[PDB]
């Protein structure tokens, strides 16, 4: 027929390429990396602050 | 290609416009990250009731 | 003009004259060329109309609408080959002549020149399409449709001449159309509304209003072998189009009365397409449909007002092409399995597969997607009939949905696995199946490039 | 082209450039670059025809009709002078249908020309526009006589209401 | 390699054709494409004047 | 500017190349998909351009092209719509639909 | 609501002298598969119960009919009724809104159509 | 709406301001609080409710924004000082319920 | 080209039992309760006689089901009674006759109210009477 690459799983747990996942994790930075500008520089709210109108005079 | 054209996506497409409205900018607390505020017990209770 | 009428009568002894079995493509092969003629002087004006002769306008008047009729009949003779090719040639010469014989009236009408030639060639027919009727039915029903099929279209068409011979002598001469230029109107009195209401309930009983057309789906349930003269008699019905030379003038000023024409005819086409849902005969679920969106034309013309005439004039000739198609696939689906029973012919599209988009462009025509003429013709309805009253929105607005759920439950019905006991069903629609099956889609959808050509004057 | 005073525009205002700045710009790398891939294969060959087109030079006249015919002519029941008077009717009701179409187009250069103000520029199209229509279905529109277009015996019974009712029943005129 | 053509008679016959229907045409239609204003800012004539 | 629409028209008119090609082109075989799923990948790219050039000097379009029917006064014709929800939209309609074939 | 729809009810012992309710069914399957299993049939079966179906619904009534039961009267409540209705509605506008059309103007000038 | 005089145009969509359209103003603080020029407001390309307070200072953001195409920040503390133009505007109008407050009631 | 007798003739009742079955065996024994009784309300010529009516309702349920065929699909010999609803309707579902829809529908039609009142954030209710204000009370300057 087609080919024989890979043999099933009897709950034996397949085995994978060992460039499947290396190449892929390198896609758990571009989260984790692209997240560090978060805090830095920016804070919670990036805003200035309502000084309560107190000058009803 | 998704995943690549998803992160940095968000920020190419907002950050040229040219601004067409006056968001207010003046945000109080407590109406801040109301909304992350309620998800962060979203996955309290997530995986409490999981 | 005589340009047409004599070669459609000089094709008459083109056939009996023939040999044997090379009649059908000796005249089918000339029926075409007419069509180079058919187009030939027409399509000029345009800006006011042509008239060329004493007693004929062919057609000017921007109702072409002539060249369909020259189209359908060498349609038949591809549609009508299929059973009746059983008998004996003597009589298949007969059926091809009074086929014809039906063919040269309605080329003499829609040009007539004026109201009393229309007349008693409005009657001429019912002595050709009788006795295709009649004859070469298939069941024992048919008997009955002979007479229902009169009895209404001669019953109350004698009011005419005595209302057009009442014309005749009070205002000058009806001769001619082309001249009203003289027209008093017609104000009131006990005696006006008779002649308005003569003058126009002849027409009603051809183009059904919900009430008195208890005759269309006797007459076509049960009709001739291929739709050989059903193709025929849904050119006849929208041929009422007459009312359009008539109550554009000639009693302008009444519509005081129109409301019992509008309201029964418009709750009708609400109505009548909702009966049609549950029919188990196909060839009746096709004839319901021929009332109901041709029954919106009724509302159109009453009301005065153009842009209906806009929309009014694509719709005669709108389903003039889909209605009539249907009738073409219904009779094929039905030479191989001799029932018409719908629920009979299920698990079909695996074993015709080229039938399959011959089905869907049919029923996506009553659907109208937007680009089509369909469309194009319905919606300059809504735009002047919304401005009569705002409420019309709604009736008219739900023929939009039930007619959607109306067609699709037709085709969706011939998807689905049947194997089921057929061994017949063999044919994979040989050419005949699928050429004269075309030769309607292709023009259909064509003309809406340049559809300028399907309009009135307004 | 066309007839400039039969389609007025205002002039095109260019803008300045601006460059201030020390960085590359790509569209100079594709204006230069787009137009030497078009210009060859496309101006060549609308100039390679055009002069291939000198060699004959056809004619369509420009067809203007002859008016004698009036509105006051001539005969109550007559056919032969009343056939004509619709004909000067007739066509002047295709005229004007079509002198709302071009006034029309017009008024979409008030907008997308500007867009931006699309209230304090123009000073015409609109505050002309509501005051042509007005001048429009009043008495050269049969309504709702349309379907029959009515030429010239309703023609003028609009425009009797508009003289037998105006200017005399208006008390005291 | 080359299957360089492909990409040639996939793109390069319609952009020609479709601009001969332009450059021959948007002085032809009396109001044709309507495309907008410059925005001008006040880089050419003026002073700014702020800043305030 | 003269290239600015034209290049629109060109994602448009492309995509029908796949159609007309379909009744005896001498049709590509089976990656016929292929033949597709390149026909998308240069209409892209092709959108891509006209992105920039709006978003440095504005000026969106339409085009006049091609009377269809003219009834009494209103005339309809056809046309296309350059705005802003044209320029960004498209251009991420075909891209993903780029990748999901 | 629509329905109960009765998945239990009274039984036991009683009607269990009823049987052969599947005598009669038994024979036809029996019958019909004596009908439906032969090398040589290339064709639609009968099956009355269609032929029933239509031709005691269609056609059938007017036969059976009589114009006497006043829940037969019953359908001037139907047929006619809301038929003078749309005329009630109607006919009061395109009144209300023609008077209008004379004295006052309530439309605009760039209404040419219509 | 100080001025509530005719106006020699009548061009709608306030092409006709007051003067120069305020959100209320003055009343007192600021008598003429002062904005921009209007035959330059509108002629460039400007929004409406781009027509309140700090026109004068929003159209320079722009202008840098044109300055460098490929580039995500021009100015953030500019943007900053938007609030510092707005804020400042906007908090100088959270003092009409100060005064309304006191005023409306018992004297 | 079936001769005599096609269909049903003038019933309720001639003879019950000389129905089904004589042909059109719609009962076995002359009573199934499949007899062709079911002309409830005559006078209205619907349904005469019939190997027919009133035989139960909700649907051929197409399972399993599998004498042959049974439902739907390949169409058992002779029983056809009632049909063409039969392909849009089906049987009993998990509850019963609760509407707590019309419940949940008006259950915001409690808020209704909630539309009556207005959501300004700033300031807070603070109760009040005369403090409303919202945009002027006393003097301009
Ligand atoms: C015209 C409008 C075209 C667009 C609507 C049609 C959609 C394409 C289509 O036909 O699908 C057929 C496809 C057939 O399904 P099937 O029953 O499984 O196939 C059975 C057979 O193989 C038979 O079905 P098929 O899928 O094989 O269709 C036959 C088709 C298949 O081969 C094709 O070339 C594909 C055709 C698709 C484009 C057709 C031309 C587009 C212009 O072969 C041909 O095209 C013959 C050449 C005709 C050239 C015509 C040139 C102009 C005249 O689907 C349909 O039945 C419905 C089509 C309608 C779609 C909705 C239309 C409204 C939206
Ligand atoms: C093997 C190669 C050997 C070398 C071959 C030679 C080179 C290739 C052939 C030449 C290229 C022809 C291309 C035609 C389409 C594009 C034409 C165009 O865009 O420019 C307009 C171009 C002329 O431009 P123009 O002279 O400046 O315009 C003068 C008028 O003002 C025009 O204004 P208008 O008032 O007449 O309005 C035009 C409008 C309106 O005309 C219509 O098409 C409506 C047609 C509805 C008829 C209604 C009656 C139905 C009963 O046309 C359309 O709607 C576009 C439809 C596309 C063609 C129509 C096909 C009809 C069948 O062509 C035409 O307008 C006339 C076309 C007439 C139909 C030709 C049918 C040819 C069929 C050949 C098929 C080729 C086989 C393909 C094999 C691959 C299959 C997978
Ligand atoms: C019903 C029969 C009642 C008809 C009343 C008499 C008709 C009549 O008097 O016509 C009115 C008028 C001709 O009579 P007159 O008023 O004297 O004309 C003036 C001449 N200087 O003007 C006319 O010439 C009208 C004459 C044509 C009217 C003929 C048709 C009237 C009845 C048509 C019924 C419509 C369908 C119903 C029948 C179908 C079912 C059988």
């Given at each position: 027929?087609?080919?024989?690459?890979?043999?099933?799983?009897?709950?034996?747990?397949?085995?994978?390429?060992?460039?499947?996942?290396?190449?892929?994790?390198?896609?758990?930075?571009?989260?984790?990396?692209?997240?560090?500008?978060?805090?830095?520089?920016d804070?919670?709210?990036?805003?200035?602050?309502?000084?309560?109108?107190?000058?009803?005079? | 290609?998704?995943?690549?054209?998803?992160?940095?996506?968000?920020?190419?497409?907002?950050?040229?416009?040219?601004?067409?409205?006056?968001?207010?900018?003046?945000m109080?607390?407590?109406?801040?990250?109301?909304?992350?505020?309620?998800?962060?017990?979203?996955?309290?209770?997530?995986?409490?009731?999981? | 003009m005589?340009?047409?009428?004599?070669?459609?009568?000089?094709?008459?002894?083109?056939?009996?004259?023939?040999?044997?079995?090379?009649?059908?493509?000796?005249?089918?092969?000339?029926?075409?060329?007419?069509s180079?003629?058919?187009?030939?002087?027409?399509?000029?004006?345009?800006?006011?109309?042509?008239?060329?002769?004493?007693?004929?306008?062919?057609?000017?008047?921007?109702?072409?609408?002539?060249?369909?009729?020259?189209?359908?009949?060498?349609?038949?003779?591809?549609?009508?080959?299929?059973?009746?090719?059983?008998?004996?040639?003597?009589?298949?010469?007969?059926?091809?002549?009074?086929?014809?014989?039906?063919?040269?009236?309605?080329?003499?009408?829609?040009?007539?020149?004026?109201?009393?030639?229309?007349?008693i060639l409005?009657?001429?027919?019912?002595?050709?399409?009788?006795?295709?009727?009649?004859?070469?039915?298939?069941?024992?029903?048919?008997?009955?449709?002979?007479?229902?099929?009169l009895?209404?279209?001669?019953?109350?068409?004698?009011?005419?001449?005595?209302?057009?011979?009442?014309?005749?002598?009070?205002?000058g001469?009806?001769?001619?159309?082309?001249?009203?230029?003289?027209?008093?109107?017609?104000?009131?009195?006990?005696?006006?509304?008779?002649?308005?209401?003569?003058?126009?309930?002849?027409?009603?009983?051809?183009?059904?209003?919900?009430?008195?057309?208890?005759?269309?789906?006797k007459?076509?349930?049960?009709?001739?072998?291929?739709?050989?003269?059903?193709?025929?008699?849904?050119?006849?019905?929208?041929?009422?189009?007459?009312?359009?030379?008539?109550?554009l003038?000639?009693?302008?000023?009444?519509?005081?009365?129109?409301?019992?024409?509008?309201?029964?005819?418009?709750?009708?086409?609400?109505?009548?397409?909702?009966?049609?849902?549950?029919?188990?005969?196909?060839?009746s679920?096709?004839?319901?449909?021929?009332?109901?969106?041709?029954?919106?034309?009724?509302?159109?013309?009453?009301?005065?007002?153009?842009?209906?005439?806009?929309?009014?004039?694509?719709?005669?000739?709108?389903h003039?092409?889909?209605?009539?198609?249907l009738?073409?696939?219904?009779?094929?689906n039905?030479?191989?399995?001799?029932?018409?029973?719908?629920?009979?012919?299920?698990?079909?599209?695996?074993?015709?597969?080229?039938?399959?988009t011959?089905?869907?462009?049919?029923?996506?025509?009553?659907?109208?997607?937007?680009?089509?003429?369909?469309?194009?013709?319905?919606?300059?309805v809504?735009?002047?009939?919304?401005?009569?009253?705002?409420?019309?929105?709604?009736?008219?607005?739900?023929?939009?949905?039930?007619?959607?759920?109306?067609?699709?439950?037709?085709?969706?019905?011939?998807?689905?696995?049947?194997?089921?006991?057929?061994?017949?069903?063999?044919?994979?629609?040989?050419?005949?199946?699928?050429?004269?099956?075309?030769?309607?889609?292709?023009?259909?959808?064509?003309?809406?490039?340049?559809?300028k050509?399907?309009?009135?004057?307004? | 082209?066309?007839?400039?005073?039969?389609?007025?525009?205002?002039?095109?205002?260019t803008?300045?450039?601006?460059?201030?700045?020390?960085?590359?710009?790509?569209?100079?790398?594709?204006?230069?670059?787009?137009?030497?891939?078009?210009?060859?294969?496309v101006?060549l060959?609308?100039?390679?025809?055009?002069?291939?087109?000198?060699?004959?030079?056809?004619?369509?006249?420009?067809?203007?009709?002859?008016?004698?015919?009036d509105?006051?002519?001539?005969?109550?029941?007559?056919?032969?002078?009343?056939?004509?008077?619709?004909?000067?009717?007739?066509?002047?009701?295709?005229?004007?249908?079509?002198?709302?179409?071009?006034?029309?187009?017009?008024?979409?250069?008030?907008?997308?020309?500007?867009?931006?103000?699309?209230r304090?520029?123009?000073?015409?199209?609109?505050?002309?526009?509501?005051?042509?229509?007005?001048?429009?279905?009043?008495?050269?529109?049969?309504?709702?006589?349309?379907?029959?277009?009515?030429?010239?015996?309703?023609?003028?019974?609009?425009?009797?209401?508009?003289?037998?009712?105006?200017?005399?029943?208006?008390?005291?005129? | 390699?080359?299957?360089?053509?492909?990409?040639?008679?996939?793109?390069?016959?319609?952009?020609?054709?479709?601009?001969?229907?332009?450059?021959?045409?948007?002085?032809?239609?009396?109001?044709?494409?309507?495309?907008?204003?410059?925005?001008?800012?006040?880089?050419?004539?003026?002073?700014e004047?702020?800043?305030? | 500017?003269?290239?600015?629409?034209?290049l629109?028209?060109?994602?448009?008119?492309?995509?029908?190349?796949?159609i007309?090609?379909?009744?005896?082109?001498?049709?590509?075989?089976?990656?016929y998909?292929?033949?597709?799923?390149?026909?998308?990948?240069?209409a892209?790219?092709?959108?891509?351009?006209?992105?920039?050039?709006?978003?440095?000097?504005?000026?969106?379009?339409?085009?006049?092209?091609?009377?269809?029917?003219?009834?009494?006064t209103?005339?309809?014709?056809?046309?296309?719509?350059?705005?802003?929800?044209?320029?960004?939209?498209?251009?991420?309609?075909?891209?993903?639909?780029?990748?999901?074939? | 609501?629509?329905?109960?729809?009765?998945?239990?009810?009274?039984?036991?012992?009683?009607?269990?002298?009823?049987?052969?309710?599947?005598?009669?069914?038994?024979?036809?399957?029996?019958?019909?598969?004596?009908?439906?299993?032969?090398?040589?049939?290339?064709?639609?079966?009968?099956?009355?119960?269609?032929?029933?179906?239509?031709?005691?619904?269609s056609?059938?009534?007017?036969?059976?009919?009589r114009?006497?039961?006043?829940?037969?009267?019953?359908?001037?409540?139907?047929?006619?009724?809301?038929?003078?209705?749309?005329?009630?509605?109607?006919?009061?506008?395109?009144?209300?809104?023609?008077?209008?059309?004379?004295?006052?103007?309530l439309?605009?000038?760039?209404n040419?159509?219509? | 709406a100080?001025?509530?005089?005719?106006?020699?145009?009548?061009?709608?969509?306030?092409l006709?301001?007051?003067?120069?359209?305020?959100?209320?103003?003055?009343?007192?603080?600021?008598?003429?609080?002062m904005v921009?020029?209007?035959?330059?407001?509108?002629?460039?390309?400007?929004?409406?409710?781009?027509?309140?307070?700090?026109?004068?200072?929003?159209?320079?953001?722009?202008?840098?924004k044109?300055?460098?195409?490929?580039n995500?920040?021009?100015?953030?503390?500019?943007?900053?000082?938007?609030?510092?133009?707005?804020?400042?505007?906007?908090?100088?109008?959270?003092?009409?319920?100060?005064?309304?407050?006191?005023?409306?009631?018992?004297? | 080209?079936?001769?005599?007798?096609?269909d049903?003739?003038?019933?309720?009742?001639?003879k019950?039992?000389?129905?089904?079955?004589?042909?059109?065996?719609?009962?076995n024994?002359?009573?199934?309760?499949?007899?062709?009784?079911?002309?409830?309300?005559?006078?209205?010529?619907?349904?005469?006689?019939?190997?027919?009516?009133?035989?139960?309702?909700?649907?051929?349920?197409?399972?399993?089901?599998?004498?042959?065929?049974?439902?739907?699909?390949?169409?058992?010999?002779?029983?056809?009674?009632?049909?063409?609803?039969?392909?849009?309707?089906?049987?009993?579902?998990?509850?019963?006759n609760?509407?707590?829809?019309?419940?949940?529908?008006?259950?915001?039609?409690?808020?209704?109210?909630?539309?009556?009142?207005?959501?300004?954030?700033?300031?807070?209710?603070?109760?009040?009477?005369?403090?409303?204000?919202?945009?002027?009370?006393?003097?301009?300057?």
């Amino acid at each position: 027929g087609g080919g024989a690459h890979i043999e099933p799983r009897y709950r034996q747990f397949p085995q994978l390429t060992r460039s499947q996942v290396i190449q892929a994790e390198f896609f758990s930075a571009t989260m984790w990396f692209w997240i560090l500008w978060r805090f830095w520089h920016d804070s919670d709210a990036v805003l200035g602050h309502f000084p309560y109108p107190d000058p009803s005079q | 290609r998704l995943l690549i054209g998803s992160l940095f996506a968000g920020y190419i497409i907002s950050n040229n416009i040219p601004p067409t409205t006056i968001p207010q900018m003046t945000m109080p607390y407590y109406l801040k990250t109301t909304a992350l505020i309620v998800t962060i017990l979203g996955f309290i209770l997530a995986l409490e009731i999981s | 003009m005589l340009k047409y009428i004599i070669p459609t009568i000089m094709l008459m002894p083109l056939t009996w004259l023939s040999k044997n079995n090379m009649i059908w493509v000796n005249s089918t092969a000339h029926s075409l060329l007419i069509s180079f003629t058919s187009l030939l002087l027409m399509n000029q004006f345009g800006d006011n109309s042509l008239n060329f002769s004493l007693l004929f306008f062919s057609d000017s008047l921007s109702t072409p609408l002539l060249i369909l009729t020259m189209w359908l009949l060498p349609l038949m003779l591809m549609a009508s080959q299929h059973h009746l090719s059983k008998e004996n040639l003597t009589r298949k010469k007969l059926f091809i002549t009074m086929l014809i014989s039906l063919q040269l009236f309605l080329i003499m009408t829609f040009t007539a020149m004026e109201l009393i030639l229309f007349y008693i060639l409005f009657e001429a027919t019912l002595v050709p399409t009788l006795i295709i009727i009649t004859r070469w039915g298939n069941q024992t029903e048919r008997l009955n449709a002979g007479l229902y099929f009169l009895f209404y279209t001669l019953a109350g068409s004698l009011p005419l001449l005595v209302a057009l011979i009442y014309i005749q002598n009070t205002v000058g001469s009806l001769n001619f159309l082309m001249l009203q230029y003289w027209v008093q109107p017609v104000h009131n009195s006990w005696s006006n509304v008779f002649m308005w209401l003569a003058c126009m309930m002849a027409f009603m009983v051809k183009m059904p209003l919900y009430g008195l057309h208890l005759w269309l789906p006797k007459a076509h349930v049960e009709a001739p072998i291929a739709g050989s003269m059903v193709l025929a008699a849904v050119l006849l019905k929208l041929g009422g189009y007459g009312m359009l030379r008539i109550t554009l003038i000639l009693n302008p000023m009444t519509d005081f009365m129109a409301y019992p024409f509008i309201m029964l005819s418009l709750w009708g086409m609400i109505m009548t397409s909702s009966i049609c849902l549950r029919q188990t005969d196909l060839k009746s679920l096709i004839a319901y449909s021929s009332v109901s969106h041709m029954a919106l034309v009724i509302v159109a013309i009453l009301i005065q007002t153009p842009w209906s005439y806009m929309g009014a004039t694509a719709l005669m000739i709108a389903h003039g092409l889909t209605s009539s198609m249907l009738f073409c696939l219904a009779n094929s689906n039905y030479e191989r399995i001799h029932s018409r029973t719908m629920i009979l012919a299920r698990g079909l599209q695996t074993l015709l597969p080229l039938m399959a988009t011959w089905w869907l462009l049919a029923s996506l025509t009553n659907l109208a997607l937007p680009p089509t003429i369909n469309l194009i013709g319905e919606l300059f309805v809504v735009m002047s009939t919304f401005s009569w009253s705002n409420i019309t929105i709604i009736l008219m607005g739900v023929n939009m949905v039930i007619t959607a759920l109306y067609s699709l439950y037709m085709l969706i019905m011939t998807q689905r696995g049947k194997y089921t006991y057929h061994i017949n069903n063999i044919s994979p629609s040989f050419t005949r199946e699928n050429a004269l099956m075309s030769l309607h889609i292709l023009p259909l959808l064509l003309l809406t490039l340049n559809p300028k050509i399907i309009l009135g004057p307004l | 082209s066309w007839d400039k005073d039969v389609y007025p525009e205002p002039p095109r205002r260019t803008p300045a450039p601006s460059p201030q700045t020390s960085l590359p710009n790509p569209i100079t790398y594709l204006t230069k670059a787009f137009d030497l891939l078009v210009d060859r294969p496309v101006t060549l060959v609308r100039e390679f025809i055009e002069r291939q087109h000198a060699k004959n030079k056809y004619y369509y006249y420009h067809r203007e009709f002859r008016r004698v015919p009036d509105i006051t002519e001539c005969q109550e029941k007559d056919v032969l002078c009343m056939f004509e008077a619709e004909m000067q009717w007739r066509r002047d009701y295709k005229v004007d249908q079509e002198i709302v179409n071009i006034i029309q187009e017009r008024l979409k250069a008030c907008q997308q020309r500007e867009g931006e103000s699309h209230r304090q520029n123009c000073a015409k199209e609109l505050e002309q526009f509501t005051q042509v229509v007005k001048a429009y279905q009043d008495r050269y529109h049969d309504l709702g006589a349309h379907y029959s277009a009515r030429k010239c015996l309703a023609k003028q019974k609009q425009r009797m209401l508009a003289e037998r009712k105006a200017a005399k029943e208006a008390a005291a005129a | 390699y080359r299957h360089s053509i492909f990409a040639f008679t996939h793109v390069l016959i319609p952009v020609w054709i479709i601009h001969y229907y332009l450059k021959y045409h948007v002085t032809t239609k009396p109001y044709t494409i309507v495309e907008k204003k410059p925005r001008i800012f006040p880089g050419d004539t003026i002073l700014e004047t702020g800043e305030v | 500017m003269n290239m600015f629409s034209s290049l629109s028209l060109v994602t448009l008119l492309l995509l029908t190349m796949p159609i007309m090609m379909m009744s005896f082109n001498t049709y590509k075989p089976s990656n016929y998909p292929l033949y597709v799923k390149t026909a998308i990948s240069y209409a892209f790219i092709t959108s891509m351009i006209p992105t920039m050039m709006f978003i440095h000097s504005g000026q969106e379009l339409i085009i006049s092209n091609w009377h269809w029917l003219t009834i009494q006064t209103l005339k309809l014709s056809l046309s296309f719509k350059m705005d802003y929800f044209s320029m960004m939209f498209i251009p991420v309609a075909l891209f993903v639909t780029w990748s999901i074939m | 609501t629509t329905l109960d729809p009765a998945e239990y009810d009274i039984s036991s012992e009683t009607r269990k002298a009823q049987a052969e309710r599947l005598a009669i069914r038994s024979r036809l399957k029996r019958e019909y598969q004596l009908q439906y299993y032969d090398p040589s049939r290339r064709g639609v079966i009968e099956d009355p119960a269609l032929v029933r179906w239509t031709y005691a619904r269609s056609a059938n009534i007017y036969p059976n009919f009589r114009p006497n039961t006043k829940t037969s009267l019953l359908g001037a409540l139907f047929g006619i009724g809301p038929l003078v209705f749309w005329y009630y509605v109607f006919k009061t506008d395109r009144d209300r809104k023609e008077k209008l059309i004379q004295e006052g103007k309530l439309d605009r000038t760039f209404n040419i159509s219509y | 709406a100080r001025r509530y005089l005719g106006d020699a145009s009548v061009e709608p969509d306030p092409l006709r301001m007051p003067t120069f359209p305020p959100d209320y103003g003055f009343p007192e603080r600021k008598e003429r609080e002062m904005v921009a020029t209007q035959q330059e407001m509108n002629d460039a390309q400007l929004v409406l409710q781009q027509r309140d307070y700090c026109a004068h200072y929003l159209i320079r953001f722009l202008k840098c924004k044109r300055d460098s195409f490929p580039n995500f920040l021009a100015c953030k503390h500019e943007r900053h000082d938007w609030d510092y133009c707005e804020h400042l505007d906007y908090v100088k109008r959270m003092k009409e319920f100060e005064r309304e407050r006191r005023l409306l009631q018992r004297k | 080209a079936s001769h005599i007798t096609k269909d049903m003739l003038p019933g309720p009742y001639p003879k019950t039992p000389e129905e089904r079955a004589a042909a059109a065996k719609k009962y076995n024994m002359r009573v199934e309760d499949y007899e062709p009784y079911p002309d409830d309300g005559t006078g209205y010529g619907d349904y005469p006689k019939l190997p027919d009516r009133s035989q139960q309702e909700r649907d051929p349920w197409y399972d399993w089901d599998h004498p042959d065929l049974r439902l739907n699909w390949g169409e058992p010999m002779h029983w056809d009674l009632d049909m063409y609803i039969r392909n849009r309707v089906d049987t009993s579902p998990t509850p019963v006759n609760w509407n707590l829809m019309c419940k949940h529908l008006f259950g915001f039609v409690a808020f209704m109210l909630f539309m009556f009142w207005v959501g300004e954030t700033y300031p807070a209710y603070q109760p009040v009477g005369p403090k409303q204000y919202p945009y002027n009370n006393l003097y301009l300057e």
